[PDB]
């Protein structure tokens, strides 16, 4: 039952997997946390569940679809994102709740 604070970076599917990837940043970061034997604490979520939380309508109602987001519990990498990224909305979030149960789920 006990809450964490989720960072969120969104954008369009179409921007993040084709416009301006983000693989290689990822392939990085993970390449980095694994030299420092350091747990991964960034994900790459596709069409994003915490997005269809009631609370999240407007947002996603504002996000072109289909949407995708880099979500991690480390504040700093998401603002950095947004910086790195620009054409995005950045956000956070409490979860597991009972309206973001799967905080890092995707529904497809
Ligand atoms: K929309």
Same mark, same amino acid.
């Given at each position: ?7 969120? $970076? ?6 993040? !997997?084709? +416009?301006?990837?983000?693989?290689? $940043?990822?392939?990085?970061? %993970? ?9 991964? *604490?960034? /994900? !790459? ?12 309508? *407007? ?13 991690? %519990?480390?504040?700093?990498?998401? %603002? /950095? !994102? ?6 995005? $909305?950045?956000? +956070? ?5 009972? %309206? ?9």
């Amino acid at each position: 039952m006990k809450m964490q604070t989720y960072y969120y $970076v969104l954008a369009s599917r179409r921007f993040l !997997l084709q +416009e301006e990837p983000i693989e290689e $940043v990822l392939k990085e970061r %993970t390449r980095h946390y694994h030299e420092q034997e350091k747990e991964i *604490d960034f /994900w !790459l979520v596709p069409q994003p569940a915490f997005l269809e939380a009631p609370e999240f309508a *407007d947002i996603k109602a504002k996000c072109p679809q289909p949407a995708a987001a880099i979500i991690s %519990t480390n504040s700093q990498f998401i %603002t /950095w !994102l947004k910086l790195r990224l620009e054409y995005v $909305v950045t956000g +956070e979030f409490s979860a597991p709740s009972e %309206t973001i149960p799967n905080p890092l789920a995707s529904l497809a």
